[PDB]
Each structure stands twice: as structure tokens, then as C-alpha cells.
């Protein structure tokens, strides 16, 4: 999973249709994730990218996964609109998100202990 | 077609059959009433709200609200029901 | 537009949707199919206010933007003389750990 060094400019608008602070992540030519400045909720940003480049987006504070144009965003030939939205989380994952935000890293089963500690992470999703 | 989901404290929630089939655990318990000995009403009502929320949004999608007081119990129920 | 409701009486709660243009009587028909009671033996309430069979749900304050799927509006139900409106509250959550 890497960006194609096409050198063909592609105009892109990062549109945050989510209540989260979106963190854009660019996968460089070696697959390494590169973070870009964050987007407050409901805000947009015109950015300069290239054709064949790879972008994914997360919650800047918790790294929860987000959808762009309903996982990976690849700028194509022209600007292209990147609609970042909340996915329909599972009720379990949604509960884990809320509990994670109220407790620092409980009368719960040992299996759910590891679920709370298995934070969302870009490197883990990249292997997936 | 509707099914009945009974909480631990006796509350009887009547939701659409296809809504309840979202949880694989509930489909096994139906194959039409289900009694939940471990899930109180203030948790099971949120689960049913999630069924409608999931079927409707699966337009911009709003956040599913979870009050902090019910987060831990809803987590255990969601883990058991695998939804 | 769809409105999302909890029709509640005693320890019963029905999760269903309806059109904002549908009438109170048509909602009683939905209840009839589920609880096997005719509309003439049903009273519907918004909080404490009795709803008239001819008025649409939108007229009664059940709008698509307030009766949301993740937070549905509550319609009180009362069966038949007519019993008083009784809605058993949900259990109380424990103290915050
Ligand atoms: O809502 C609940 C609350 C608990 C415990 O408080 C609970 C425990 C086990 C289970 O399988 C489901 C549960 O659901």
C-alpha cells in the first residue's frame, strides 16, 4: 500500500462531514503513513495532491477509523471532493470509544480488557 | 413481523424482526420472544435504538449517543450480542 | 419523511417508524396489528396531551428531525372505561465508577 509517484497534480478538497477532528494521512512512496494538519469538524480544505496517491483519515485524538467517499481515497484526473464521514460503528466499538474517552489507560470480563487496550491504530489497519 | 425482547426487569420491547436479526446472538435465540436475564431495560432500550439507527444509516451520518452512565453496561451487552 | 417512535404503555415499548403525514388513527392501526387491540380501545398521547385521530403526526410535533432513529420520540398508549396513562420508567443506571 503505497502512493504512485505519478507527478501528475490532482486538486483535492478535504471535506469533514463528521463531528470529529479529522487527521488526514498520506501513504508516501514507501508505504509509511504521513500525517497532515488536522481539520476541525465541519471545515474544509483545498489541498494539493497527485494522481494515484493514497489517503486515509482518522480521528485526530483517538485514531478511530473514518470513511472517505464511503476507506482509501485516491485522487483521480480532474477538483476532486473527499467526503469524510462517520461510519456506522458497531455498538461494541462505539461503546469502547466512549469508555476509552472517560477512563485513563473496571468490573468487566478479561476479554473486554484487551479490547479496550487494542486501540485503533493506523499501522494495524494498514496490515489489514 | 415483530419480535419481543424482554429485559431483566420485565420491560417488553417490541421491534421489527429484521431489526433484531442484526445481532447473530438474537437470531440463535429466536431459532418468538427472547428473555435477557443480564440486560436491564435502560440498556436494552438503547440496543433497540441502535437497531433503527443501524438499519437507517447503513446522507451525513450522525454520532450514536451513549451517556457515560450506561456505557459500561451497554459495552457488556454489545459484546455478548456481538452487535 | 419518516419519524421514529417508541409507543409505550406500562412495561411495553414498540419501536416503529411512520410518515410525518400519517395520522394518529393510522398509528393506532399499527398498534392494532402488534398488540391485537382495535383503535377505538386505544388512546394516544404526546406527554400528557390526548391526540386526535384526524391530526397528522407532524401536526402533533413528531417531526423527522426530532423523532430520530437513534433518539426516537415517545407516544403514550392507554387501553380501554379507559385506564389512566401509565408508563413504567426504565431501570436506573448505577453510579459512575
Ligand atoms: O447490560 C448488561 C449488563 C451486564 C452486567 O452489568 C451484562 C453482563 C453480561 C452480559 O452478557 C450482558 C450484560 O449486559
Closest by Cα among A86, A67, A80, A88 to A14: A80
- With a 6 Å cutoff on the Cβ, whether B15 touches ligand 1 is no
What backbone phi and psi angles, to 5 degrees, belong to C29? Answer: -70, -40
* Domain span including residue A15: 9-85
Is residue C87 exposed (0-12), middle (13-18) or buried (19+ Cβ within 10 Å)? middle
- Check whether residue A66 and residue A104 sit in a common domain: no
- With a 6 Å cutoff on the Cβ, whether B77 touches ligand 1 is yes
A21 interface with B at CB cutoff 8 Å: no
CATH architecture of C2-97: Roll (3.10)
What's the DSSP call for residue B50? H
Say which CATH number the domain at A18 has.
2.60.40.780
Q: Which ligand 1 atom lies nearest to the CA of residue B81?
A: 11
CA distances in angstroms from B28 to B23, B55, B60, C63, listed in the order given = 9, 20, 33, 36
How far is C-alpha A106 from the chain's CA centre? 29
- Check whether residue A66 and residue A18 sit in a common domain: yes
Closest by Cα among B8, B59, B10 to B37: B8
CB B73 within 8 A of CB A106: no
Say which CATH number the domain at A126 has.
1.10.750.10
d(CA C51, CA C69): 22
Non-local (6+) Cβ contacts of A109 within 8 A are B76, B79
Maximum pairwise Cα distance, chain B: 37
Contact A99 B72 (CB under 8 A): yes
Helix (H) or strand (E) holding A45: strand A44-50
CB C13 within 8 A of CB C90: no
A3 in a domain, yes or no? no
User: Packing angle between helix B71-81 and helix A91-100, nearest 10 degrees?
Assistant: 150
Closest by Cα among A106, C92, C13, A104 to B76: A106
* Length reported for chain B: 83
A2 in a domain, yes or no? no
Q: How many separate domains does chain B show? A: 1
Secondary structure, 3-state, B53-79: HHHHHCCCCCCCCCCHHHHHHHHHHHH
| Structure determination technique employed | X-ray
H-assigned helices in chain A: 91-100, 110-117, 122-127
Q: How many separate domains does chain A show? A: 2
- Check whether residue A74 and residue A114 sit in a common domain: no
A102 in a domain, yes or no? yes
d(CA A45, CA C81): 64
- Check whether residue A59 and residue A40 sit in a common domain: yes
Say which CATH number the domain at B29 has.
3.30.710.10
d(CA A26, CA A20): 18
Q: What is the structure's resolution, reported in angstroms to one decimal?
A: 2.5
Conformational region of residue B38, where left means phi above 0, alpha means psi within -120 to 50, and beta covers everything else = alpha
Atom 5 of ligand 1 has which residue's CA nearest to it?
B73
Closest by Cα among A51, C89, C85, C46 to B41: C89
* Domain span including residue B83: 1-83
Domain extents in chain C = 2-97
Helix (H) or strand (E) holding C4: strand C2-9
- Check whether residue A14 and residue A71 sit in a common domain: yes
Residues A66-75: contacts with CB under 8 Å, at least 24 apart: A66/A18, A66/A20, A66/A22, A75/A10, A75/A11, A75/A12, A75/A49, A75/A50, A75/A51
- Check whether residue A68 and residue A96 sit in a common domain: no
How far is C-alpha A27 from the chain's CA centre? 12
Pocket test for ligand 1, best of B7, B8, B80 (most atoms within 8 A of CB): B80
Amino acid at each position: 500500500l503505497r502512493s504512485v509517484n505519478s507527478r501528475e497534480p490532482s486538486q483535492v478538497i478535504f471535506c469533514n462531514r463528521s463531528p470529529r477532528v479529522v487527521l488526514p494521512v498520506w501513504l508516501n512512496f514507501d508505504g509509511e503513513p504521513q500525517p497532515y494538519p488536522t481539520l476541525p469538524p465541519g471545515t474544509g480544505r483545498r489541498i494539493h495532491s497527485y494522481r494515484g496517491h493514497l489517503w486515509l483519515f482518522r480521528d485526530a485524538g483517538t485514531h478511530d477509523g473514518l470513511l472517505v467517499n464511503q476507506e482509501l481515497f485516491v485522487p483521480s484526473l480532474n477538483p476532486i471532493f473527499a467526503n469524510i464521514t462517520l461510519p456506522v460503528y458497531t455498538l461494541k466499538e462505539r461503546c469502547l470509544q466512549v469508555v476509552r474517552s472517560l477512563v485513563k489507560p473496571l468490573d468487566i470480563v478479561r476479554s473486554l480488557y484487551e479490547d479496550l487496550e487494542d486501540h485503533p491504530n493506523v499501522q494495524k489497519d494498514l496490515e489489514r | 413481523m415483530y419480535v419481543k425482547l424482554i429485559s431483566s426487569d420485565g420491560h417488553e420491547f417490541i421491534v421489527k424482526r429484521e431489526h433484531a436479526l442484526t445481532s447473530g446472538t438474537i437470531k440463535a435465540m429466536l431459532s418468538n420472544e427472547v428473555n435477557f436475564r443480564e440486560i436491564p431495560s435502560h440498556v436494552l432500550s438503547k440496543v433497540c435504538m441502535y437497531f433503527t439507527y443501524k438499519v437507517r444509516y447503513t446522507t451525513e451520518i450522525p454520532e450514536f449517543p451513549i451517556a457515560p452512565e450506561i456505557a459500561l453496561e451497554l459495552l457488556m451487552a454489545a459484546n455478548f450480542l456481538d452487535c | 419523511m419518516d419519524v421514529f417512535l417508541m409507543i409505550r404503555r406500562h412495561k411495553t415499548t414498540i419501536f416503529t417508524d411512520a410518515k410525518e403525514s400519517s395520522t394518529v388513527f393510522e398509528l393506532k392501526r399499527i398498534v392494532e396489528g402488534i398488540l391485537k387491540r382495535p383503535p377505538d380501545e386505544q388512546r394516544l398521547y404526546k406527554d400528557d396531551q390526548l391526540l386526535d385521530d384526524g391530526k397528522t403526526l407532524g401536526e402533533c410535533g413528531f417531526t423527522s428531525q426530532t423523532a430520530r432513529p437513534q433518539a426516537p420520540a415517545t407516544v403514550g398508549l392507554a387501553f380501554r372505561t379507559f385506564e389512566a396513562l401509565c408508563i413504567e420508567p426504565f431501570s436506573s443506571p448505577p453510579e459512575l465508577p
